[PDB]
Design an enzyme around this catalytic site. Structure first.
Site, PDB file in Angstrom:
ATOM      1  N   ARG A 274      -0.101   4.693   2.791  1.00  0.00           N
ATOM      2  CA  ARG A 274       0.036   4.542   4.242  1.00  0.00           C
ATOM      3  C   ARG A 274       0.314   5.792   5.086  1.00  0.00           C
ATOM      4  O   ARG A 274       0.211   5.731   6.309  1.00  0.00           O
ATOM      5  CB  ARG A 274       1.032   3.427   4.576  1.00  0.00           C
ATOM      6  CG  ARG A 274       0.439   2.053   4.291  1.00  0.00           C
ATOM      7  CD  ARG A 274       1.457   1.010   4.601  1.00  0.00           C
ATOM      8  NE  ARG A 274       2.459   0.825   3.539  1.00  0.00           N
ATOM      9  CZ  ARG A 274       3.571   0.095   3.688  1.00  0.00           C
ATOM     10  NH1 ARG A 274       3.825  -0.506   4.865  1.00  0.00           N
ATOM     11  NH2 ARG A 274       4.433  -0.046   2.673  1.00  0.00           N
TER      12      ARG A 274
ATOM     13  N   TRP B 227      -9.310   6.125  -1.086  1.00  0.00           N
ATOM     14  CA  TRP B 227      -9.559   6.787  -2.367  1.00  0.00           C
ATOM     15  C   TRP B 227      -8.506   6.325  -3.377  1.00  0.00           C
ATOM     16  O   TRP B 227      -7.459   5.817  -2.988  1.00  0.00           O
ATOM     17  CB  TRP B 227      -9.565   8.318  -2.229  1.00  0.00           C
ATOM     18  CG  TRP B 227      -8.335   8.909  -1.601  1.00  0.00           C
ATOM     19  CD1 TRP B 227      -7.112   9.153  -2.213  1.00  0.00           C
ATOM     20  CD2 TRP B 227      -8.197   9.357  -0.241  1.00  0.00           C
ATOM     21  NE1 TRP B 227      -6.240   9.716  -1.302  1.00  0.00           N
ATOM     22  CE2 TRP B 227      -6.874   9.854  -0.092  1.00  0.00           C
ATOM     23  CE3 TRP B 227      -9.061   9.382   0.869  1.00  0.00           C
ATOM     24  CZ2 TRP B 227      -6.394  10.374   1.130  1.00  0.00           C
ATOM     25  CZ3 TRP B 227      -8.582   9.897   2.088  1.00  0.00           C
ATOM     26  CH2 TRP B 227      -7.260  10.385   2.208  1.00  0.00           C
TER      27      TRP B 227
ATOM     28  N   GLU C 236      -4.190   3.671 -10.976  1.00  0.00           N
ATOM     29  CA  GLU C 236      -4.929   2.406 -10.806  1.00  0.00           C
ATOM     30  C   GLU C 236      -6.007   2.331 -11.879  1.00  0.00           C
ATOM     31  O   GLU C 236      -6.185   1.296 -12.517  1.00  0.00           O
ATOM     32  CB  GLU C 236      -5.565   2.301  -9.414  1.00  0.00           C
ATOM     33  CG  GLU C 236      -4.582   2.464  -8.271  1.00  0.00           C
ATOM     34  CD  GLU C 236      -5.263   2.436  -6.902  1.00  0.00           C
ATOM     35  OE1 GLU C 236      -5.629   1.334  -6.436  1.00  0.00           O
ATOM     36  OE2 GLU C 236      -5.408   3.511  -6.284  1.00  0.00           O
TER      37      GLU C 236
ATOM     38  N   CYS D 239       0.807  -1.211   0.000  1.00  0.00           N
ATOM     39  CA  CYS D 239       0.000   0.000   0.000  1.00  0.00           C
ATOM     40  C   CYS D 239       0.852   1.280   0.000  1.00  0.00           C
ATOM     41  O   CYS D 239       1.550   1.593   0.987  1.00  0.00           O
ATOM     42  CB  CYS D 239      -0.952   0.039   1.202  1.00  0.00           C
ATOM     43  SG  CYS D 239      -1.996   1.541   1.210  1.00  0.00           S
TER      44      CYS D 239
HETATM   45  C1  HEM Z   1      -6.310   6.470   1.717  1.00  0.00           C
HETATM   46  C2  HEM Z   1      -6.149   6.279   0.396  1.00  0.00           C
HETATM   47  C3  HEM Z   1      -5.385   5.067  -0.174  1.00  0.00           C
HETATM   48  C4  HEM Z   1      -4.597   5.021  -1.262  1.00  0.00           C
HETATM   49  C5  HEM Z   1      -4.248   6.188  -2.224  1.00  0.00           C
HETATM   50  C6  HEM Z   1      -4.122   3.654  -1.406  1.00  0.00           C
HETATM   51  C7  HEM Z   1      -3.293   3.187  -2.404  1.00  0.00           C
HETATM   52  C8  HEM Z   1      -3.066   1.867  -2.732  1.00  0.00           C
HETATM   53  C9  HEM Z   1      -2.579   1.344  -3.996  1.00  0.00           C
HETATM   54  C10 HEM Z   1      -2.234   2.157  -5.265  1.00  0.00           C
HETATM   55  C11 HEM Z   1      -2.491   0.016  -3.872  1.00  0.00           C
HETATM   56  C12 HEM Z   1      -2.046  -0.986  -4.963  1.00  0.00           C
HETATM   57  C13 HEM Z   1      -3.387  -1.474  -5.521  1.00  0.00           C
HETATM   58  C14 HEM Z   1      -3.288  -2.396  -6.704  1.00  0.00           C
HETATM   59  O1  HEM Z   1      -2.567  -2.088  -7.695  1.00  0.00           O
HETATM   60  O2  HEM Z   1      -3.976  -3.453  -6.639  1.00  0.00           O
HETATM   61  C15 HEM Z   1      -2.906  -0.349  -2.535  1.00  0.00           C
HETATM   62  C16 HEM Z   1      -2.956  -1.625  -2.011  1.00  0.00           C
HETATM   63  C17 HEM Z   1      -3.383  -1.966  -0.750  1.00  0.00           C
HETATM   64  N1  HEM Z   1      -3.939  -1.083   0.185  1.00  0.00           N
HETATM   65 FE1  HEM Z   1      -3.932   1.001   0.069  1.00  0.00          FE
HETATM   66  N2  HEM Z   1      -4.641   2.904  -0.376  1.00  0.00           N
HETATM   67  C18 HEM Z   1      -5.429   3.724   0.412  1.00  0.00           C
HETATM   68  C19 HEM Z   1      -6.167   3.345   1.513  1.00  0.00           C
HETATM   69  C20 HEM Z   1      -6.122   2.087   2.098  1.00  0.00           C
HETATM   70  C21 HEM Z   1      -6.836   1.617   3.279  1.00  0.00           C
HETATM   71  C22 HEM Z   1      -7.878   2.431   4.069  1.00  0.00           C
HETATM   72  C23 HEM Z   1      -6.456   0.351   3.533  1.00  0.00           C
HETATM   73  C24 HEM Z   1      -6.906  -0.623   4.659  1.00  0.00           C
HETATM   74  C25 HEM Z   1      -7.349  -0.199   5.848  1.00  0.00           C
HETATM   75  C26 HEM Z   1      -5.497   0.005   2.514  1.00  0.00           C
HETATM   76  C27 HEM Z   1      -4.846  -1.183   2.441  1.00  0.00           C
HETATM   77  C28 HEM Z   1      -4.270  -1.752   1.336  1.00  0.00           C
HETATM   78  C29 HEM Z   1      -3.939  -3.167   1.193  1.00  0.00           C
HETATM   79  C30 HEM Z   1      -4.114  -4.323   2.195  1.00  0.00           C
HETATM   80  C31 HEM Z   1      -3.354  -3.300  -0.201  1.00  0.00           C
HETATM   81  C32 HEM Z   1      -2.872  -4.615  -0.867  1.00  0.00           C
HETATM   82  C33 HEM Z   1      -4.108  -5.129  -1.631  1.00  0.00           C
HETATM   83  C34 HEM Z   1      -3.835  -6.363  -2.457  1.00  0.00           C
HETATM   84  O3  HEM Z   1      -2.875  -7.091  -2.124  1.00  0.00           O
HETATM   85  O4  HEM Z   1      -4.561  -6.605  -3.465  1.00  0.00           O
HETATM   86  N3  HEM Z   1      -5.311   1.076   1.650  1.00  0.00           N
HETATM   87  N4  HEM Z   1      -3.260   0.799  -1.859  1.00  0.00           N
HETATM   88  C1  LIG Z   2      -4.635 -12.688  -6.797  1.00  0.00           C
HETATM   89  C2  LIG Z   2      -4.618 -11.371  -6.071  1.00  0.00           C
HETATM   90  C3  LIG Z   2      -3.786 -11.172  -4.968  1.00  0.00           C
HETATM   91  C4  LIG Z   2      -3.805  -9.933  -4.307  1.00  0.00           C
HETATM   92  N1  LIG Z   2      -3.014  -9.692  -3.219  1.00  0.00           N
HETATM   93  N2  LIG Z   2      -4.628  -8.957  -4.758  1.00  0.00           N
HETATM   94  C5  LIG Z   2      -5.457  -9.135  -5.821  1.00  0.00           C
HETATM   95  C6  LIG Z   2      -6.331  -7.993  -6.291  1.00  0.00           C
HETATM   96  C7  LIG Z   2      -5.635  -7.373  -7.517  1.00  0.00           C
HETATM   97  C8  LIG Z   2      -4.247  -6.777  -7.235  1.00  0.00           C
HETATM   98  N3  LIG Z   2      -4.129  -5.665  -8.188  1.00  0.00           N
HETATM   99  C9  LIG Z   2      -5.329  -5.484  -8.979  1.00  0.00           C
HETATM  100  C10 LIG Z   2      -6.381  -6.203  -8.141  1.00  0.00           C
HETATM  101  N4  LIG Z   2      -6.838  -5.297  -7.088  1.00  0.00           N
HETATM  102  C11 LIG Z   2      -7.512  -4.075  -7.485  1.00  0.00           C
HETATM  103  C12 LIG Z   2      -8.185  -3.403  -6.301  1.00  0.00           C
HETATM  104  N5  LIG Z   2      -7.193  -2.730  -5.499  1.00  0.00           N
HETATM  105  C13 LIG Z   2      -7.520  -1.434  -4.957  1.00  0.00           C
HETATM  106  C14 LIG Z   2      -6.624  -1.202  -3.766  1.00  0.00           C
HETATM  107  C15 LIG Z   2      -7.001   0.039  -3.005  1.00  0.00           C
HETATM  108  C16 LIG Z   2      -6.719   1.317  -3.504  1.00  0.00           C
HETATM  109  C17 LIG Z   2      -7.074   2.432  -2.745  1.00  0.00           C
HETATM  110  C18 LIG Z   2      -7.699   2.252  -1.499  1.00  0.00           C
HETATM  111  C19 LIG Z   2      -7.970   0.967  -1.010  1.00  0.00           C
HETATM  112  F1  LIG Z   2      -8.580   0.764   0.184  1.00  0.00           F
HETATM  113  C20 LIG Z   2      -7.618  -0.135  -1.769  1.00  0.00           C
HETATM  114  C21 LIG Z   2      -5.459 -10.351  -6.509  1.00  0.00           C
END
Ligand code: HEM
Ligand SMILES: Cc1cc(N)nc(C[C@@H]2CNC[C@@H]2NCCNCCc2cccc(F)c2)c1
Ligand code: HEM
Ligand SMILES: Cc1cc(N)nc(C[C@@H]2CNC[C@@H]2NCCNCCc2cccc(F)c2)c1
Ligand SMILES: C[C@H](O)[C@H](O)[C@H]1CNc2nc(N)[nH]c(=O)c2N1
Ligand SMILES: C[C@H](O)[C@H](O)[C@H]1CNc2nc(N)[nH]c(=O)c2N1
Ligand SMILES: [Zn+2]
EC number: 1.14.13.39
Lengths: 403, 401
Positions: free
Chosen positions: A110, A279, A284, A107
């Protein structure tokens, strides 16, 4: 230097040592023989995980070693002794949820970690009630475009009893309809979930941007289908600041990124439904969702409209179109007054967060391949920053689809 | 055991069995991944045996008379002297394998096509220089670039190394100024300062080609100026933007890495410069746009009349693309070999498939394979990769000063 990884920034020449990694209690997939950093997927046990978490909680309120700390430890083990599980106090849940976000290596957002609204839904006892909780989350989080980070936590997993699950991967997703010619109308990422919604009696649409309903599952029941009221789902029609034909493409995206299939683990307890939201970072939408070849795949369409030479790679037609699509996403969200952050501002903030965490905890787990944006990588400060990746708990973990 | 490796664009899966051949540990452990970080007889004998086994296997003569007798020779030489020497054809094989094995190289589709100059009969800095000049002439080939490596004498227990002090054969000076800013390439301030201290009369330009500091064992390094006619350079102009040419920008044709160690069968070649041709993002994105390099993004954006006041206008992205396009157009116009990042990554995907079939895998470093712009627009972004160290190998070495 010390027996801890040395971490260098190659733009600035500055150095730090990561001591936080010593706290990691879980193995990742790398060994001395081979690095697997780029792969997408990975009684006494519970009690030691619980003690660790309570120790973390008491350290965070500066009461480590106090009788309150010792009494809570005793309470947890007596709970486990007689019931096999234990339960979190309200403030323990709040602390744990924020800590799981703080700990998430993938993420980039953070810097915001301490500002998370935690909705406690541990009293939820039906699919209908999950639905109410989720609509409430969506309303609070969207806040008419002034987005607010949030998480809703449903009841934890229990011994030999079925799980609360949201079958959808996000609260908002567009349908993907498999066509007779083998192609896809809408989002090919969502073919399977669309197919399951139809099987459970959803009457499907036929558009490129049809909002999916939710499949929600309460313990030991088949999932139940719930349509989100359209006035709750904020979307942004996409237009471009200078290219007037862009609006004519009929592209759009929803405002709220809300991940709903991840497991939230706190102190050995497993919350199998705990959807969270923030947000968007613009890339993305503009780069991955719209331009991935296995997603909406619009690069060629947009390049044709811009009159680029698409028959040769060296015209950089892909690069030029990608940039304008990303610009369109930013402009449109800004015009609609919906919170969005560009990849330059997001990565600057994450660098600041890195400095914050160095001082607070002595490091920050970060997955370089996910933090570096999918366009313009080295134009952002994170490309030049070495990063150490390790698993800390509380954690969000991917979990296998329930079907 | 054997890592599953998935492509997320196509859904295809392979298993890497090659990684079991690795004999050398990297920086990761189960506790933490460090994949993003940039940096006696028995031991030598088994590395040597293994390399010779690799060699006889490659010419399909494993277990033959020639193979058994060569293993004997290696053993005899090591038992008697503590070291041994490679035959020319073995060196040629080993050099290609080190390229093939190099996880950070996206250009490996070309691995079997490499001209190897054997310079192990070099005994002086002056001789090193002639060899380097010949390498440059051959590799450059009036802009029709050809991959080459020149291998100087191996490290020896008694004595100091042959070394080229410069990190590449061709680099531009970096001149520190009164105001602490840098004129030229800031990456080269130190080597520039060394050249001046060893008696070089410096220029004062933005693109002054550096002289070479060449070192024979246990001697002070010696300074040699490259004849300007040997150094091919490309003036940069843009297909549609007329004013771009007047930025006075240029880059040199030949990327030629000169500070890496080449390790073959336990032997170490501390000077073994190699060259191919550029992928355009190295010049267009990293060398010209890194903030700690030429840093031209803002100048160009202003020439393009972009809104520099705010990140969300994507002025950096827009300027970067045009710079990359200028590099490609100018090299193509000057008829100098170059490859864009889409073409290079597509060929790298083909290389992965070739290696799966040939060897059961391919060591690759994702962070270095994915280009610094438009990452997910290339197929390598969506490709999982396993990183590990195979030998023969190129490796980084400490600056000799
Ligand atoms: C506040 C605005 C936020 C922004 C701009 C942001 C940004 C991002 C981005 C760009 C990713 C990569 C997503 C992807 O390519 O799939 C990501 C992943 C992630 N975010 Fe953040 N995030 C935000 C809020 C949060 C919140 C509120 C949480 C949880 C409480 C969170 C937890 C995570 C987690 C667990 C991932 C990994 C998801 C996965 O493995 O698919 N984010 N975030
Ligand atoms: C197989 C697998 C593993 C893994 N860890 N994950 C996935 C979801 C995939 C990761 N990459 C594209 C898709 N996830 C897309 C949705 N991710 C938005 C994350 C986000 C952004 C802003 C604020 C938030 F709270 C959350 C699949
Ligand atoms: C034929 C055309 C070639 C192309 C297009 C190419 C492309 C590249 C690129 C883009 C990189 C990353 C460079 C950086 O960011 O510093 C790289 C690294 C590397 N290449 Fe290739 N290359 C070519 C030829 C060769 C040859 C002939 C060799 C050796 C015989 C070689 C060995 C290496 C090594 C060892 C690295 C890692 C260097 C380091 O760690 O700084 N390459 N290559
Ligand atoms: C500290 C450190 C470690 C390391 N392994 N390496 C370095 C050289 C850096 C890497 N990144 C920029 C700079 N190296 C200069 C670029 N090298 C050209 C690569 C190349 C391209 C085409 C054909 C070829 F034969 C070779 C520094
Ligand atoms: C193979 C590779 O690990 C995979 O495509 C990753 C790369 N980096 C990513 N980074 C982010 N933020 N999101 C992703 O989905 C991916 N995909
Ligand atoms: C810290 C990070 O590993 C470093 O900036 C790397 C990233 N990827 C790279 N990739 C290539 N090809 N060349 C580089 O110099 C770098 N630098
Ligand atoms: Zn690793």
């Amino acid at each position: 230097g010390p027996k801890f990884p040395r971490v260098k920034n190659w733009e600035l020449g500055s150095i730090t040592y990561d001591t936080l990694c010593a706290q990691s209690q879980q193995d990742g997939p790398c060994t001395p023989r081979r690095c697997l950093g780029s792969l997408v997927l990975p009684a006494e046990q519970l009690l030691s995980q619980a003690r660790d978490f309570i120790n973390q909680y008491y350290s965070s309120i500066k009461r480590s070693g106090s009788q309150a700390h010792e009494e809570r430890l005793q309470e947890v083990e007596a709970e486990v002794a007689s019931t096999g599980t234990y339960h979190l106090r309200e403030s323990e849940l709040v602390f744990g949820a924020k800590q799981a976000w703080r700990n998430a290596p993938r993420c980039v957002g953070r810097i915001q970690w301490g500002k998370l609204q935690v909705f406690d839904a541990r009293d939820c006892s039906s699919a209908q009630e999950m639905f109410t909780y989720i609509c409430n989350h969506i309303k609070y989080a969207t806040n008419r475009g002034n987005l607010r980070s949030a998480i809703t936590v449903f009841p934890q997993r229990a011994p030999g009893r079925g799980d609360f699950r949201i079958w959808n991967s996000q609260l908002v997703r567009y349908a993907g309809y498999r066509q007779q010619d083998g192609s896809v109308r809408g989002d090919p990422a969502n073919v399977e979930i669309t197919e399951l919604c139809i099987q459970h009696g959803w009457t499907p649409g036929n558009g490129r941007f049809d909002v999916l309903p939710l499949l929600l599952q309460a313990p030991d029941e088949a999932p139940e289908l719930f349509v989100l009221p359209p006035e709750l789902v904020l979307e942004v029609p996409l237009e471009h600041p200078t290219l007037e034909w862009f609006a004519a493409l009929g592209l759009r995206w929803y405002a709220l990124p809300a991940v709903s299939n991840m497991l939230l683990e706190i102190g050995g307890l497993e919350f199998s439904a705990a959807p969270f939201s923030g947000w968007y970072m613009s890339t993305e939408i503009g780069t991955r969702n719209l331009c991935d070849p296995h997603r909406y795949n619009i690069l060629e369409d947009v390049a044709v409209c811009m009159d680029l030479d698409t028959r040769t790679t060296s015209s950089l037609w892909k690069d030029k179109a990608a940039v304008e699509i990303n610009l369109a996403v930013l402009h449109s969200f800004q015009l609609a007054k919906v919170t969005i952050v560009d990849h330059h501002a997001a990565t600057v903030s994450f660098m600041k967060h890195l400095d914050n965490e160095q001082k607070a905890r002595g490091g920050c787990p970060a997955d370089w391949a996910w933090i570096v944006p999918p366009i313009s990588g080295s134009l952002t400060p994170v490309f030049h920053q070495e990063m150490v990746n390790y698993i800390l708990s509380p954690a969000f973990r991917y979990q296998p689809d329930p079907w």
